[PDB]
Design an enzyme around this catalytic site. Structure first.
Site, PDB file in Angstrom:
ATOM      1  N   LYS A 281     117.310  32.229   4.651  1.00  0.00           N
ATOM      2  CA  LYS A 281     117.937  32.005   6.009  1.00  0.00           C
ATOM      3  C   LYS A 281     119.098  30.965   5.740  1.00  0.00           C
ATOM      4  O   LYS A 281     120.232  31.052   6.454  1.00  0.00           O
ATOM      5  CB  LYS A 281     116.898  31.432   6.809  1.00  0.00           C
ATOM      6  CG  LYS A 281     115.571  32.333   7.156  1.00  0.00           C
ATOM      7  CD  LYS A 281     114.845  31.875   8.277  1.00  0.00           C
ATOM      8  CE  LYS A 281     113.825  32.695   8.513  1.00  0.00           C
ATOM      9  NZ  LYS A 281     112.684  32.914   7.441  1.00  0.00           N
TER      10      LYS A 281
ATOM     11  N   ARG B  28     112.447   9.476  28.682  1.00  0.00           N
ATOM     12  CA  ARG B  28     112.303   8.425  27.904  1.00  0.00           C
ATOM     13  C   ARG B  28     113.095   7.047  28.470  1.00  0.00           C
ATOM     14  O   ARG B  28     113.907   7.152  29.292  1.00  0.00           O
ATOM     15  CB  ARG B  28     113.214   8.442  26.393  1.00  0.00           C
ATOM     16  CG  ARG B  28     112.510   9.693  25.424  1.00  0.00           C
ATOM     17  CD  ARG B  28     113.178   9.668  24.270  1.00  0.00           C
ATOM     18  NE  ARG B  28     112.721   8.770  23.336  1.00  0.00           N
ATOM     19  CZ  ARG B  28     111.503   8.890  22.638  1.00  0.00           C
ATOM     20  NH1 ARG B  28     110.786  10.056  22.796  1.00  0.00           N
ATOM     21  NH2 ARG B  28     111.287   8.045  21.673  1.00  0.00           N
TER      22      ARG B  28
ATOM     23  N   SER C 249     106.510   4.796  18.894  1.00  0.00           N
ATOM     24  CA  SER C 249     107.955   4.755  18.636  1.00  0.00           C
ATOM     25  C   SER C 249     108.547   3.008  19.103  1.00  0.00           C
ATOM     26  O   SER C 249     109.479   2.864  18.295  1.00  0.00           O
ATOM     27  CB  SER C 249     108.682   5.581  19.583  1.00  0.00           C
ATOM     28  OG  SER C 249     108.346   5.216  20.820  1.00  0.00           O
ATOM     29  N   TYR C 250     108.174   2.417  19.827  1.00  0.00           N
ATOM     30  CA  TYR C 250     108.352   1.020  19.866  1.00  0.00           C
ATOM     31  C   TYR C 250     108.254   0.476  18.670  1.00  0.00           C
ATOM     32  O   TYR C 250     109.414  -0.425  18.156  1.00  0.00           O
ATOM     33  CB  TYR C 250     107.538   0.475  21.127  1.00  0.00           C
ATOM     34  CG  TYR C 250     107.957  -0.908  21.539  1.00  0.00           C
ATOM     35  CD1 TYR C 250     108.741  -1.178  22.647  1.00  0.00           C
ATOM     36  CD2 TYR C 250     107.244  -2.328  20.861  1.00  0.00           C
ATOM     37  CE1 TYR C 250     109.031  -2.504  22.865  1.00  0.00           C
ATOM     38  CE2 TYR C 250     107.689  -3.378  21.208  1.00  0.00           C
ATOM     39  CZ  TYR C 250     108.516  -3.639  22.288  1.00  0.00           C
ATOM     40  OH  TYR C 250     108.913  -4.740  22.699  1.00  0.00           O
TER      41      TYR C 250
ATOM     42  N   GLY D 168     109.363   7.332  24.458  1.00  0.00           N
ATOM     43  CA  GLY D 168     108.714   8.522  25.459  1.00  0.00           C
ATOM     44  C   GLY D 168     107.515   7.954  26.241  1.00  0.00           C
ATOM     45  O   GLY D 168     107.110   8.598  27.403  1.00  0.00           O
ATOM     46  N   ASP D 169     106.850   7.098  25.803  1.00  0.00           N
ATOM     47  CA  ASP D 169     105.546   6.176  26.633  1.00  0.00           C
ATOM     48  C   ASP D 169     105.340   5.202  25.761  1.00  0.00           C
ATOM     49  O   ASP D 169     106.300   4.468  24.887  1.00  0.00           O
ATOM     50  CB  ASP D 169     104.464   7.209  26.484  1.00  0.00           C
ATOM     51  CG  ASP D 169     103.700   7.144  24.882  1.00  0.00           C
ATOM     52  OD1 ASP D 169     104.227   6.773  23.879  1.00  0.00           O
ATOM     53  OD2 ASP D 169     102.592   7.710  24.998  1.00  0.00           O
TER      54      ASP D 169
ATOM     55  N   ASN E  86     102.045  10.233   9.548  1.00  0.00           N
ATOM     56  CA  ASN E  86     100.690   9.942   9.357  1.00  0.00           C
ATOM     57  C   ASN E  86     100.131  11.420   8.682  1.00  0.00           C
ATOM     58  O   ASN E  86      99.131  11.153   7.943  1.00  0.00           O
ATOM     59  CB  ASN E  86      99.835  10.148  10.944  1.00  0.00           C
ATOM     60  CG  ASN E  86      99.998   8.780  11.312  1.00  0.00           C
ATOM     61  OD1 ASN E  86     100.547   7.849  10.876  1.00  0.00           O
ATOM     62  ND2 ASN E  86      99.731   8.620  12.640  1.00  0.00           N
TER      63      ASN E  86
HETATM   64 MG    MG Z   1     101.208   7.535  23.406  1.00  0.00          MG
HETATM   65 MG    MG Z   2     104.388   6.660  22.047  1.00  0.00          MG
HETATM   66 NA    NA Z   3     106.625  12.111  23.404  1.00  0.00          NA
END
Ligand code: MG
Ligand code: MG
Ligand code: NA
Ligand code: CL
Ligand code: CL
Ligand code: CL
Ligand code: NA
Ligand code: NA
Length: 330
Positions: free
Chosen positions: A77, A151, A182-183, A191-192, A278
DNA sequence: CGGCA
DNA sequence: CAGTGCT
DNA sequence: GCCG
DNA sequence: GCACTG
Protein backbone atom coordinates in the site's frame (compact mmCIF):
# COMPACT_ATOMS: atom_id res chain seq x y z
CA UNK A 1 13.87 -2.24 22.05
CA UNK A 2 13.47 -0.59 18.63
CA UNK A 3 10.39 -2.81 18.27
CA UNK A 4 8.65 -1.38 21.36
CA UNK A 5 6.97 2.01 21.28
CA UNK A 6 7.01 2.06 25.10
CA UNK A 7 10.84 2.01 24.80
CA UNK A 8 10.80 5.22 22.70
CA UNK A 9 9.77 8.85 23.25
CA UNK A 10 6.46 9.67 21.63
CA UNK A 11 7.88 13.01 20.45
CA UNK A 12 9.34 10.96 17.57
CA UNK A 13 5.86 11.31 16.03
CA UNK A 14 5.97 15.13 15.91
CA UNK A 15 8.25 14.93 12.84
CA UNK A 16 6.02 12.69 10.70
CA UNK A 17 7.85 12.37 7.37
CA UNK A 18 5.14 10.10 5.92
CA UNK A 19 1.94 12.09 6.46
CA UNK A 20 0.81 11.54 2.86
CA UNK A 21 0.72 7.82 3.71
CA UNK A 22 -0.54 7.87 7.29
CA UNK A 23 -3.46 10.20 6.58
CA UNK A 24 -4.75 7.68 4.03
CA UNK A 25 -4.07 4.59 6.15
CA UNK A 26 -5.98 6.24 9.00
CA UNK A 27 -9.15 6.40 6.88
CA UNK A 28 -8.91 2.66 6.30
CA UNK A 29 -8.03 1.88 9.91
CA UNK A 30 -11.18 3.68 11.08
CA UNK A 31 -13.31 1.87 8.50
CA UNK A 32 -12.15 -1.53 9.77
CA UNK A 33 -12.56 -0.37 13.36
CA UNK A 34 -16.21 0.74 13.10
CA UNK A 35 -17.09 -2.46 11.20
CA UNK A 36 -15.69 -4.51 14.10
CA UNK A 37 -12.51 -5.89 12.49
CA UNK A 38 -10.57 -4.95 15.58
CA UNK A 39 -7.42 -6.96 14.95
CA UNK A 40 -6.97 -5.64 11.41
CA UNK A 41 -7.59 -2.13 12.71
CA UNK A 42 -4.99 -2.74 15.43
CA UNK A 43 -2.35 -3.71 12.87
CA UNK A 44 -3.09 -0.51 10.96
CA UNK A 45 -2.81 1.58 14.12
CA UNK A 46 0.60 0.07 14.90
CA UNK A 47 1.76 0.55 11.31
CA UNK A 48 0.64 4.18 11.42
CA UNK A 49 2.64 4.83 14.60
CA UNK A 50 5.66 3.11 13.03
CA UNK A 51 5.42 5.37 9.97
CA UNK A 52 4.88 8.51 12.06
CA UNK A 53 8.06 7.84 14.06
CA UNK A 54 10.27 6.70 11.17
CA UNK A 55 13.28 8.95 10.66
CA UNK A 56 12.72 9.65 6.94
CA UNK A 57 10.16 9.28 4.15
CA UNK A 58 9.77 5.65 3.12
CA UNK A 59 10.81 5.27 -0.52
CA UNK A 60 11.15 1.55 -1.28
CA UNK A 61 9.35 -1.75 -0.72
CA UNK A 62 12.42 -3.26 0.96
CA UNK A 63 12.76 -0.25 3.26
CA UNK A 64 9.10 -0.43 4.26
CA UNK A 65 9.27 -4.16 5.04
CA UNK A 66 12.27 -3.61 7.33
CA UNK A 67 10.22 -1.34 9.62
CA UNK A 68 8.71 -3.29 12.55
CA UNK A 69 4.95 -3.10 12.16
CA UNK A 70 5.10 -2.94 8.35
CA UNK A 71 4.64 -6.22 6.50
CA UNK A 72 4.34 -7.18 2.86
CA UNK A 73 0.70 -6.07 2.63
CA UNK A 74 1.28 -2.67 4.25
CA UNK A 75 4.45 -2.24 2.17
CA UNK A 76 2.40 -2.78 -1.00
CA UNK A 77 0.00 0.00 0.00
CA UNK A 78 2.88 2.36 0.77
CA UNK A 79 4.37 1.78 -2.68
CA UNK A 80 1.01 2.40 -4.35
CA UNK A 81 0.64 5.76 -2.61
CA UNK A 82 4.21 6.70 -3.57
CA UNK A 83 3.84 6.06 -7.30
CA UNK A 84 0.17 6.94 -7.88
CA UNK A 85 -0.36 9.51 -5.12
CA UNK A 86 -3.49 7.74 -3.87
CA UNK A 87 -4.73 4.43 -2.46
CA UNK A 88 -7.38 2.75 -4.60
CA UNK A 89 -8.96 0.94 -1.66
CA UNK A 90 -10.14 4.28 -0.26
CA UNK A 91 -12.69 4.39 -3.11
CA UNK A 92 -13.96 0.91 -2.13
CA UNK A 93 -14.85 1.26 1.54
CA UNK A 94 -18.21 -0.16 2.57
CA UNK A 95 -20.98 2.38 2.14
CA UNK A 96 -22.18 1.67 5.70
CA UNK A 97 -19.03 3.13 7.28
CA UNK A 98 -20.12 6.79 7.78
CA UNK A 99 -23.34 5.66 9.52
CA UNK A 100 -21.55 3.02 11.58
CA UNK A 101 -19.16 5.74 12.76
CA UNK A 102 -22.08 8.06 13.58
CA UNK A 103 -23.78 5.33 15.66
CA UNK A 104 -20.70 4.00 17.45
CA UNK A 105 -19.86 7.53 18.62
CA UNK A 106 -22.86 7.11 20.93
CA UNK A 107 -21.38 6.31 24.34
CA UNK A 108 -22.38 2.74 25.19
CA UNK A 109 -22.96 1.69 21.57
CA UNK A 110 -20.08 -0.23 20.03
CA UNK A 111 -19.62 -1.97 16.70
CA UNK A 112 -22.12 -4.75 17.44
CA UNK A 113 -24.91 -2.32 18.33
CA UNK A 114 -24.13 0.00 15.43
CA UNK A 115 -24.20 -2.90 12.95
CA UNK A 116 -27.54 -4.06 14.35
CA UNK A 117 -29.06 -0.59 14.05
CA UNK A 118 -27.73 -0.37 10.49
CA UNK A 119 -29.23 -3.77 9.63
CA UNK A 120 -32.56 -2.60 11.06
CA UNK A 121 -32.50 0.28 8.55
CA UNK A 122 -31.56 3.19 10.80
CA UNK A 123 -29.35 5.79 9.14
CA UNK A 124 -29.46 8.93 11.33
CA UNK A 125 -29.53 9.91 14.97
CA UNK A 126 -33.13 10.97 14.39
CA UNK A 127 -33.86 7.33 13.51
CA UNK A 128 -32.07 6.23 16.69
CA UNK A 129 -33.90 8.75 18.87
CA UNK A 130 -37.34 7.88 17.54
CA UNK A 131 -37.09 4.14 16.79
CA UNK A 132 -34.20 2.41 18.61
CA UNK A 133 -34.29 0.69 21.97
CA UNK A 134 -31.55 2.40 23.96
CA UNK A 135 -29.84 1.24 27.11
CA UNK A 136 -29.73 3.70 29.99
CA UNK A 137 -26.11 4.45 29.06
CA UNK A 138 -26.85 4.92 25.37
CA UNK A 139 -29.69 7.33 26.16
CA UNK A 140 -27.26 9.51 28.12
CA UNK A 141 -24.70 9.18 25.33
CA UNK A 142 -27.25 10.33 22.75
CA UNK A 143 -28.39 13.20 24.98
CA UNK A 144 -24.75 14.38 25.14
CA UNK A 145 -23.74 13.32 21.63
CA UNK A 146 -22.08 16.57 20.56
CA UNK A 147 -20.58 17.36 23.95
CA UNK A 148 -18.87 13.97 24.32
CA UNK A 149 -17.17 14.52 20.93
CA UNK A 150 -15.74 17.89 22.06
CA UNK A 151 -12.44 18.36 23.84
CA UNK A 152 -12.14 20.88 26.57
CA UNK A 153 -9.29 23.34 27.23
CA UNK A 154 -6.85 21.95 29.79
CA UNK A 155 -7.72 24.93 32.04
CA UNK A 156 -11.26 23.54 32.31
CA UNK A 157 -9.87 20.11 33.12
CA UNK A 158 -7.95 21.76 35.96
CA UNK A 159 -11.17 23.30 37.31
CA UNK A 160 -12.93 19.92 37.18
CA UNK A 161 -10.05 18.17 38.95
CA UNK A 162 -10.05 20.89 41.62
CA UNK A 163 -13.81 20.46 42.10
CA UNK A 164 -13.35 16.74 42.76
CA UNK A 165 -10.27 17.34 44.90
CA UNK A 166 -11.97 19.94 47.10
CA UNK A 167 -14.99 17.70 47.70
CA UNK A 168 -12.76 14.73 48.52
CA UNK A 169 -10.38 16.61 50.82
CA UNK A 170 -13.33 18.16 52.67
CA UNK A 171 -13.88 14.87 54.52
CA UNK A 172 -10.29 13.61 54.55
CA UNK A 173 -7.58 16.26 54.15
CA UNK A 174 -4.92 13.60 53.50
CA UNK A 175 -6.44 12.26 50.28
CA UNK A 176 -4.26 12.65 47.19
CA UNK A 177 -6.03 13.55 43.93
CA UNK A 178 -4.22 13.62 40.58
CA UNK A 179 -5.56 14.28 37.09
CA UNK A 180 -4.14 11.63 34.76
CA UNK A 181 -4.85 10.73 31.13
CA UNK A 182 -4.20 13.33 28.47
CA UNK A 183 -4.08 16.06 31.12
CA UNK A 184 -1.05 14.54 32.85
CA UNK A 185 0.53 13.92 29.44
CA UNK A 186 0.49 17.72 28.98
CA UNK A 187 -2.02 18.01 26.13
CA UNK A 188 -3.56 21.40 25.43
CA UNK A 189 -7.05 19.88 25.26
CA UNK A 190 -8.69 16.91 26.99
CA UNK A 191 -11.54 14.66 25.89
CA UNK A 192 -12.45 14.05 29.54
CA UNK A 193 -10.96 14.34 33.02
CA UNK A 194 -9.39 11.28 34.66
CA UNK A 195 -9.03 11.70 38.42
CA UNK A 196 -7.07 9.20 40.52
CA UNK A 197 -7.60 9.28 44.29
CA UNK A 198 -5.65 7.50 47.01
CA UNK A 199 -4.46 8.03 50.58
CA UNK A 200 -0.84 7.61 51.79
CA UNK A 201 -1.94 5.80 54.98
CA UNK A 202 -2.92 2.77 52.91
CA UNK A 203 -6.41 2.51 54.32
CA UNK A 204 -8.47 5.73 54.29
CA UNK A 205 -9.26 5.40 50.59
CA UNK A 206 -11.86 2.77 51.51
CA UNK A 207 -15.54 3.69 51.26
CA UNK A 208 -14.98 7.25 50.02
CA UNK A 209 -16.91 6.86 46.74
CA UNK A 210 -20.31 6.98 48.42
CA UNK A 211 -19.48 10.18 50.31
CA UNK A 212 -17.61 11.78 47.39
CA UNK A 213 -20.31 11.15 44.79
CA UNK A 214 -23.09 12.30 47.12
CA UNK A 215 -21.11 15.46 47.88
CA UNK A 216 -20.62 16.15 44.17
CA UNK A 217 -24.32 15.49 43.58
CA UNK A 218 -25.37 17.84 46.40
CA UNK A 219 -23.84 20.79 44.54
CA UNK A 220 -25.33 19.72 41.21
CA UNK A 221 -21.89 19.13 39.70
CA UNK A 222 -22.61 15.57 38.55
CA UNK A 223 -25.35 15.52 35.93
CA UNK A 224 -25.47 11.87 34.82
CA UNK A 225 -23.89 8.53 35.79
CA UNK A 226 -22.66 6.12 33.12
CA UNK A 227 -20.94 3.47 35.27
CA UNK A 228 -21.20 3.57 39.06
CA UNK A 229 -21.65 0.35 41.04
CA UNK A 230 -22.55 1.81 44.45
CA UNK A 231 -24.43 -1.11 46.00
CA UNK A 232 -21.77 -3.37 47.58
CA UNK A 233 -19.00 -0.92 48.60
CA UNK A 234 -16.32 -2.54 46.41
CA UNK A 235 -16.57 0.15 43.71
CA UNK A 236 -13.25 0.94 42.02
CA UNK A 237 -14.25 3.32 39.22
CA UNK A 238 -16.86 5.94 38.41
CA UNK A 239 -17.66 7.06 34.87
CA UNK A 240 -20.07 9.93 34.47
CA UNK A 241 -20.89 13.45 33.39
CA UNK A 242 -20.33 16.80 35.08
CA UNK A 243 -20.80 20.48 34.31
CA UNK A 244 -19.20 23.45 36.00
CA UNK A 245 -21.48 26.27 37.20
CA UNK A 246 -22.26 29.37 35.19
CA UNK A 247 -22.94 30.32 31.59
CA UNK A 248 -21.09 28.98 28.59
CA UNK A 249 -20.48 25.57 30.18
CA UNK A 250 -20.73 22.21 28.41
CA UNK A 251 -21.28 18.78 29.87
CA UNK A 252 -17.94 17.03 30.31
CA UNK A 253 -16.98 13.41 30.81
CA UNK A 254 -15.47 12.61 34.21
CA UNK A 255 -13.77 9.35 35.22
CA UNK A 256 -12.70 8.70 38.82
CA UNK A 257 -10.75 5.75 40.22
CA UNK A 258 -10.00 5.20 43.92
CA UNK A 259 -7.02 2.96 44.67
CA UNK A 260 -5.00 1.69 47.65
CA UNK A 261 -1.69 3.45 48.09
CA UNK A 262 0.25 0.23 47.57
CA UNK A 263 -1.06 0.24 43.98
CA UNK A 264 -0.49 3.97 43.40
CA UNK A 265 2.41 3.71 40.94
CA UNK A 266 0.72 1.09 38.75
CA UNK A 267 -2.63 2.90 38.84
CA UNK A 268 -0.90 6.19 37.91
CA UNK A 269 0.89 4.51 35.03
CA UNK A 270 -2.30 2.91 33.77
CA UNK A 271 -4.49 6.01 34.07
CA UNK A 272 -1.87 8.27 32.49
CA UNK A 273 -1.54 6.15 29.36
CA UNK A 274 -1.64 6.63 26.51
CA UNK A 275 -3.75 3.59 25.69
CA UNK A 276 -1.30 2.38 23.05
CA UNK A 277 1.60 3.11 25.39
CA UNK A 278 -0.06 0.88 28.00
CA UNK A 279 -0.75 -1.91 25.51
CA UNK A 280 2.88 -1.79 24.37
CA UNK A 281 4.24 -1.91 27.93
CA UNK A 282 1.83 -4.71 28.86
CA UNK A 283 2.81 -6.77 25.81
CA UNK A 284 6.49 -6.28 26.71
CA UNK A 285 5.83 -7.44 30.27
CA UNK A 286 4.30 -10.65 28.91
CA UNK A 287 7.49 -11.43 26.98
CA UNK A 288 9.43 -11.15 30.25
CA UNK A 289 7.18 -13.56 32.14
CA UNK A 290 5.28 -10.73 33.85
CA UNK A 291 1.79 -9.23 33.82
CA UNK A 292 1.12 -5.50 34.23
CA UNK A 293 -2.24 -4.10 35.34
CA UNK A 294 -3.47 -1.01 37.16
CA UNK A 295 -3.07 -3.05 40.38
CA UNK A 296 0.44 -4.47 40.09
CA UNK A 297 3.39 -5.70 38.09
CA UNK A 298 3.39 -9.42 38.83
CA UNK A 299 5.23 -12.54 37.74
CA UNK A 300 3.48 -15.24 35.74
CA UNK A 301 0.86 -17.33 37.50
CA UNK A 302 1.40 -20.87 38.77
CA UNK A 303 2.38 -15.06 40.85
CA UNK A 304 4.54 -12.73 42.93
CA UNK A 305 3.82 -9.00 43.13
CA UNK A 306 6.94 -7.00 42.33
CA UNK A 307 7.77 -3.88 44.40
CA UNK A 308 6.81 -0.73 42.47
CA UNK A 309 6.71 2.28 44.81
CA UNK A 310 7.14 4.68 41.86
CA UNK A 311 6.46 4.68 38.13
CA UNK A 312 10.23 4.58 37.58
CA UNK A 313 10.38 1.14 39.21
CA UNK A 314 7.95 -0.32 36.68
CA UNK A 315 10.09 1.01 33.83
CA UNK A 316 13.22 -0.31 35.53
CA UNK A 317 11.84 -3.80 36.15
CA UNK A 318 10.87 -4.00 32.46
CA UNK A 319 14.29 -2.85 31.25
CA UNK A 320 12.87 0.39 29.82
CA UNK A 321 14.32 3.90 30.06
CA UNK A 322 12.00 6.14 32.04
CA UNK A 323 9.59 8.34 30.06
CA UNK A 324 7.89 11.37 31.58
CA UNK A 325 4.14 11.44 30.90
CA UNK A 326 4.45 13.78 27.93
CA UNK A 327 6.68 11.21 26.18
CA UNK A 328 4.10 8.41 26.56
CA UNK A 329 1.68 9.98 24.05
CA UNK A 330 1.57 7.10 21.60
C1' DC B 1 -0.98 -21.13 13.93
C1' DG B 2 -2.68 -17.81 17.28
C1' DG B 3 -2.15 -13.49 20.09
C1' DC B 4 -2.88 -8.90 19.56
C1' DA B 5 -3.56 -5.70 27.35
C1' DC C 1 -22.06 -14.71 29.23
C1' DA C 2 -21.41 -10.66 25.16
C1' DG C 3 -20.76 -6.19 24.75
C1' DT C 4 -18.64 -1.94 26.10
C1' DG C 5 -15.22 1.49 27.53
C1' DC C 6 -10.99 3.02 30.45
C1' DT C 7 -5.87 4.05 29.81
C1' DG D 1 -3.34 -5.82 9.56
C1' DC D 2 1.71 -7.62 11.92
C1' DC D 3 4.28 -10.30 15.04
C1' DG D 4 6.92 -14.48 16.95
C1' DG E 1 -5.76 -6.25 31.21
C1' DC E 2 -9.46 -4.97 33.79
C1' DA E 3 -14.28 -3.35 35.68
C1' DC E 4 -18.52 -2.65 34.50
C1' DT E 5 -23.99 -3.81 32.58
C1' DG E 6 -28.15 -6.69 31.99
MG1 MG F 1 -11.37 8.99 30.98
MG1 MG G 1 -9.00 10.92 29.46
NA1 NA H 1 -11.46 10.34 24.17
CL1 CL I 1 -14.59 -1.85 3.94
CL1 CL J 1 -9.43 15.29 57.63
CL1 CL K 1 5.47 7.56 40.92
NA1 NA L 1 8.51 -5.27 9.14
NA1 NA M 1 -19.74 4.19 21.36
Amino acid sequence: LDKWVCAQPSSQKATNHNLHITEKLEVLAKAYSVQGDKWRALGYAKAINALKSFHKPVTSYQEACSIPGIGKRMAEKIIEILESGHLRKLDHISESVPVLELFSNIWGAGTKTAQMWYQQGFRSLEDIRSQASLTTQQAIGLKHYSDFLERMPREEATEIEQTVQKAAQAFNSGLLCVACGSYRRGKATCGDVDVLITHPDGRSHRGIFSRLLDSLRQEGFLTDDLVSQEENGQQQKYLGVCRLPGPGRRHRRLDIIVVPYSEFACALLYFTGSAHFNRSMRALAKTKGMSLSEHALSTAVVGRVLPTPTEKDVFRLLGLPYREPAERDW
